[PDB]
Amino acid sequence: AGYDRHITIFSPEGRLYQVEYAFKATNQTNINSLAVRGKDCTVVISQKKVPDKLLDPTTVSYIFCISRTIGMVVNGPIPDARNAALRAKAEAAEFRYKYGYDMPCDVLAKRMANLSQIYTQRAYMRPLGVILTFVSVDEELGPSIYKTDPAGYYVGYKATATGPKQQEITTNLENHFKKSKIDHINEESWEKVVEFAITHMIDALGTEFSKNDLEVGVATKDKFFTLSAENIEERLVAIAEQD
Amino acid sequence: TSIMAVTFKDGVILGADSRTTTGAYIANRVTDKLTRVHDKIWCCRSGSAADTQAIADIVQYHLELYTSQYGTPSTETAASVFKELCYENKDNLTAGIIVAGYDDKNKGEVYTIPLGGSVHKLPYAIAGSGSTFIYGYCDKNFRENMSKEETVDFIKHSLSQAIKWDGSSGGVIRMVVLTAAGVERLIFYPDEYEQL
Amino acid sequence: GSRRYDSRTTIFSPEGRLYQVEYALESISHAGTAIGIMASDGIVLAAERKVTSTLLEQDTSTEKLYKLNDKIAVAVAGLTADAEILINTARIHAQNYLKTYNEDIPVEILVRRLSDIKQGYTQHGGLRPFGVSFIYAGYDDRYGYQLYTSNPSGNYTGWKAISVGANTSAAQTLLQMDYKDDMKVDDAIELALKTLSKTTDSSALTYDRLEFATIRKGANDGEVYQKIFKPQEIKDILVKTGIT
Amino acid sequence: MTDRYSFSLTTFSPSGKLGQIDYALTAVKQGVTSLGIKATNGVVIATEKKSSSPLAMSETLSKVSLLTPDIGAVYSGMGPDYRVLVDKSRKVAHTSYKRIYGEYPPTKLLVSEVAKIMQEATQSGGVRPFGVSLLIAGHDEFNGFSLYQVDPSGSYFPWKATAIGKGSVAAKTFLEKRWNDELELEDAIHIALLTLKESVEGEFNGDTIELAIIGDENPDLLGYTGIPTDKGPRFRKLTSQEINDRLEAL
Amino acid sequence: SDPSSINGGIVVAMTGKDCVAIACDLRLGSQSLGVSNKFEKIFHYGHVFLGITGLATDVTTLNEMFRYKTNLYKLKEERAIEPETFTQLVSSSLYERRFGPYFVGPVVAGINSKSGKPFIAGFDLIGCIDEAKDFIVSGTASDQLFGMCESLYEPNLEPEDLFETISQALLNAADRDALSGWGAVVYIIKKDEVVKRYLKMRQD
Amino acid sequence: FRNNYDGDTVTFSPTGRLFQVEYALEAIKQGSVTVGLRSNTHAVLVALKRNADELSSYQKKIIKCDEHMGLSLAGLAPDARVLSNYLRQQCNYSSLVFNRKLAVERAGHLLCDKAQKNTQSYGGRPYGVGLLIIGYDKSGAHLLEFQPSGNVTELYGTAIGARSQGAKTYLERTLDTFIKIDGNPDELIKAGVEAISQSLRDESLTVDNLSIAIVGKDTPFTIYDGEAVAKYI
Amino acid sequence: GTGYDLSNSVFSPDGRNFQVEYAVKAVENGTTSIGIKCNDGVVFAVEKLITSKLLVPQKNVKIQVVDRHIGCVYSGLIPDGRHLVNRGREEAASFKKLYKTPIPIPAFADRLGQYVQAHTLYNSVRPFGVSTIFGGVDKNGAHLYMLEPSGSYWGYKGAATGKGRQSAKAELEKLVDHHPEGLSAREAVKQAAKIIYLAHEDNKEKDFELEISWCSLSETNGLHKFVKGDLLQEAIDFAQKEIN
Amino acid sequence: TIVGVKFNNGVVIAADTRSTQGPIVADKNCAKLHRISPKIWCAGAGTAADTEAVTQLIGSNIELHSLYTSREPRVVSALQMLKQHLFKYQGHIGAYLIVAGVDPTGSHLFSIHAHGSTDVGYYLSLGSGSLAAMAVLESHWKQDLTKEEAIKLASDAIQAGIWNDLGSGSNVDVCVMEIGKDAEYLRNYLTPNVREEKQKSYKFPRGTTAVLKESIVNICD
């Protein structure tokens, strides 16, 4: 009777507690991430926290290069994050081989979401305690943000935020898009779209960032790439000469 | 078919004719036999078109999945994947493939994989039915660390002779230049290479 | 391990009963009543639709009376979804027999096979039984007009008249009271409706809450005919018998 | 490793209840309201696009899905469960019918195939039932227009009109008043929009409402000309504009 | 050696004015030896007629298979299968055995019960559909039947006329083939009724 | 506490313990005592055989695995038979494929890895027996102690089973003496008999009670039982 | 309620996996082992508790080699560590067979990572009762990694796990601060010896044996080798001098 | 005889309408132009059953893929799926296809051989009439053709096959696929092989055929 909270079977209220507890694991890292769409680019910002002095800062990342075009930022424990990353990479490679064109952001998102849904219905598979935010400049839809969760839910976003202080970043971005009356950042260069994403990250969280406190990924036409510490510093110097 | 890859000072150049024949009929006179498996790793296909395409498609898949995980694969790594498919399926494959790629550390490299599925790293490699006629010419005229202009000439002269004698070879001479500068596509029409 | 969450659906109680079979029969006891009555010149199948609405399309609806063969039909009591799984396999077994022997399957052989599948879920596999009881109405050239019943235990028996689903105890008493061996189909149609009318948990027995089927050997032919009654045809026979 | 859950997770309780099916139906009741109305010359299926954030793009989430060019589906309950059922439903229409008979299945048979998939999740080892109820509206040459409900149990019933989810009890009552056997498709869309307005709390417009019809053949949507027998799909999803036009005559 | 030439036999189908006709010979032999003079090669599943030529064991096997499949179709669909639909079932059924095929030449004939449109079709042993408006031929005397049909046939023949045409097409083709003949049966199919006639032909 | 986390081997306790493994280790302590000790030239097994009745036989404790390797058991005899049979095959495989006598150290590594697989998978149970493997390979005399946990340790001497601590303390004291008994098998066996007799209490080791095995430089693994051990009592 | 810690793959209400956290206790219970990343390589060292004089000195080796360029040392259940290296060796062989080049350290790290993480997905398996410190030299420099029972791993300048991990980590932290230009392979071996001797004070009751291995581009040609004879004694003496 | 010709704003495929068993013409008007997706059309040569089966299978899988991804089918997808299937069967599925169509990425023209080799060109031809057609294409093809020029060239190429090849005959089927608009399928675009009126009517006087036995057949159940 009381085992309806151990495996992915329905509770009397029609709820899956293992799915709800999997959602709780996504905040274990205490990391906040947001994604915004430019005129012809997509930018993901994530907090980078290195507590141990013995850690190699270069190896600590929750942003993954899935394919040439698709990037993925994860909110959750790194073992589950890397499980989801390797699977997405494998699915992106296999898709290209079988269908003869690069897997679109939203199709990989749907596929990963369908996998998560199976763990939600089969008892022997647990859900992964992660939220996957996929970004690209799709060759049909243009700048694209698609996010999946342990429930197997997925949807496209104009912009999005994930983590403990998700709601603060969300409402901040909401209020900007109510004001601008558009569904993207009206800017030609990606550098200024990254500067926007960092600016509204600071405003919402109320925290100042050094070059080692942030982790940036940019998607453009036919490439997704992550910024180095020095690329971020150049970005932090630009926002400083405005405030 | 006449195919070759030549290492030079700045990198490597792949060259091929454009003729596909089913018997004595030229099924395609503008075939692209120079196939991309990675940004700066290309291969020359010879033998069964079906087999070499099936292999190249699988290799491109393997290197795309390699890149996703471990970053840019070496030209040697690409040749190893080609080898593994060719050797382990030697009974059901008629494929002779030259693998050529530009690495920033290793510069230009050429690997040749004949029918058996063996691997041979060479300064330059020639293959296909038309190659038999230019073993003499290529051995006498090849020098190491040639210029881009010199290497293009060596391949243009070599393949023109192969085309002239081999009925299974002909059409245009396609080349693909692999250097630090990037990837350059070259084409040379009969009205040029025939009168060398 | 997984042992923690195993219900063990195929075990005996200390009394020597099969828990899941007993609880499945309890499930069926709440399903809409279905009656079969065998006469000298045919068989009748009558069933009560459990839960209806003004907006339920009755014309395109079938939840109790299914056609297995050109000579065999079933009345369902329990999970409709479970019944459709067994009905589909029964339809196939009938066609396998016809393909093999070039003869229509004798009624008992079909019934035994379905009953043997139910018995399987009772002894091995660790799956829940099918929450279904069937009334088989059929004809073959060996035993003529036959009426069978099967339940989740995988046990089957033959009847002159029988009920399954809700209020079988009451329904079986009324049938045992008014049934005679020399009965005609038209007498059996009336008996079937009278019995349902008195065992119904609803206000009145209207046409929109009934499914009706007869298996008769129309004298002006010499062959067996299955008739699954249309809504208008149920409405008619309901007025003639004196229930309006 | 290996699925060692080879036993049923849905079992009969001493009362004769199947717990996991009852609990699945409870999950369906919590879901957003969706309805279906059958007219003389078409069928309409409608639901509310409950956007989980105003930053989210409600267009990139289709609650109403094409199964075949003449069959459409809408649900109430768990979205992910619906999404994989649509994927399986589209595939089974091909594998189990079109690849055999060279034509799309009739509504009742595709419904029957979806029903089977959901029944198997009720009996098969190491799985829970699907936490959705489907409304499948379709047309076929020999049955005309039809509307079916499919429940987690695997049970399905044909409807003239019905609703499922949150305010199904109130919505079913309102449909019983307004429905007749002489309704035109435009009258059914009007009744559908009226019924759904009682369910929606916030904004009620073309951007918050998802509505599709099974009506006449759309030769403009076929994508090719020259085959007279091919006249186009009967399934059409109404645009954001097309809904707002009918909302001014509410 | 050739399984299509062991038993022998022929089938021919023709369309007329609001009618179709399908005919076949009655011979079942083993090479030169004639065994049966009563082996019919035309079967019907509702209002859809199927004629099968080729290896006799496969003729009987496919008849039993299509009765099986049409019986299940009728129970699920709650209606008789139509000629166009049945044609697709035969095609997909034969191609299922692509690399181990039934050595047969099937012929579908019937009138679509809804549209009232006459329909015939022919197949190769692996199930390639040959949909002709005029006529279909199959069997050991297919060359002969093609010659007779191509000459005798004219469009929009009345049932009584179409009978004479298909009968003469079959009879004269059969008398030029060693492995065909030994009696014949013709089916005249209309919307409402179907007439079956046994032809008097040469018994050599 | 313990009652909830000892149902199977696939479950860790809150303190980080595997109780099913520890329960298997308990089956060894209940088993009859056996002693192992080696010099630089020879390795000796001395095992006390246990009887059910005075009418029963004394169950054999030493199994030969190859001409250069063998082991003594303490716990479930069938589990000793399974593991010894596996080790026989690995010794056999090494000979046929590589024409190579299997190194005693590598025999230990294989037993360790086989025991481990029974401690991480559901449905399986740990092996309920401890083994003392002796062997003379290319790197001289060897003695191993195997535990169902998967832990294998190379030692100069040791003992396992009931009252095994008596023999283990003696060997820990006699270490410097017996290590140097090189080219004298009889003195190494006598030193092993004096070791096992330190774990007696019930009876005195008799003729059909004592079981001794030896391997070394120019001695193939041979088992001495009955009359043959009379000159050591 | 409770019972969230009885099954492996089960999430607790606070989104934790208790079976993984219980495996960490088995690791914390185990011997102390370290890894030091020097300017052109990595050094591995481990404490070997001498149970009795009966243990043959220098024989019961704990540090394991993968391929010819990777060193692996672990703390906790030694058999579980051996099982992980067995997999790692199969994994490295698979990579080399297809791609020719010996497996990069990051590539190898994720390979162990995905395998350990897989033993937290199902209730039919137990999580690994070891934290593994591993690394070596590849195409582009030296790499040091530490892998937790959860499947979690990162790159490290220095790493420590087991009984005296705090003593170790504290001593490692001092080296990172006082050598920003980077420690040498020779120095890292001496330094590793000291940290093991200092971290042994959390288990000072039992006498212990020191075991060091290293993989340096200049000192071992980028191959994993064990520290033996003179260089081992020189390192033991450096530690024995600075313990007083 | 099947051909494909690229023009500046799309692609056209054409085919004859002769089906043969050995030297006998089985169908005088069979359609060799098949629809994979609404804007991807296929012309088939070789084993008749194989070309039809492989086109229907990939067509079915392409539809399911199109619904799954919520995108228009791509020609490179139909190409990759056909080549990988044909290759797996080592040429035992004797299908030789010219696959053409328009998709979001533009207009495409490919040929697929039975062993799973693919070619890309501006003009292609396959079948027994391949060489008769290719001779016309190699003579008249230029770069930047109009829609009307491409139909003319493609049609002329099939006519070369019909007249000069015994394997090919009867009528010309054409399908035009323009980047902007719906694909238009022109069944019997040309009918240059109409049968001349017969010299005599072979209508028999009723009662000509001798009948032994007559009976009405039972269709109704």
Ligand SMILES: *C(=O)[C@H]1NC[C@@](C)(O)[C@](O)([C@H](CC2CCCCC2)NC(=O)[C@H](Cc2ccc(OC)cc2)NC(=O)[C@H](CCO)NC(=O)CN2CCOCC2)O[C@@H]1C
């Ligand atoms: C232009 O080049 C045309 N030339 C004519 C022709 C016949 O070569 C063909 O390729 C045509 C392709 C069309 C036919 C109409 C349906 C769509 C495909 N091919 C055939 O008609 C084909 C010829 C053929 C026969 C047999 C073999 O292998 C032995 C290869 C080619 N005919 C058939 O396949 C007939 C069916 C006709 O109803 N089948 C057989 O004879 C049965 N054998 C098939 C192989 O396996 C053994 C049984 O049209 C091109 C475009």
Ligand SMILES: [Cl-]
């Ligand atoms: Cl999927």
Ligand SMILES: [Cl-]
């Ligand atoms: Cl090619």
Ligand SMILES: [Cl-]
């Ligand atoms: Cl060649």
Ligand SMILES: [Mg+2]
């Ligand atoms: Mg689960």
Ligand SMILES: [Mg+2]
């Ligand atoms: Mg030439």
Ligand SMILES: [Mg+2]
């Ligand atoms: Mg004759």
Ligand SMILES: [Mg+2]
């Ligand atoms: Mg004769």
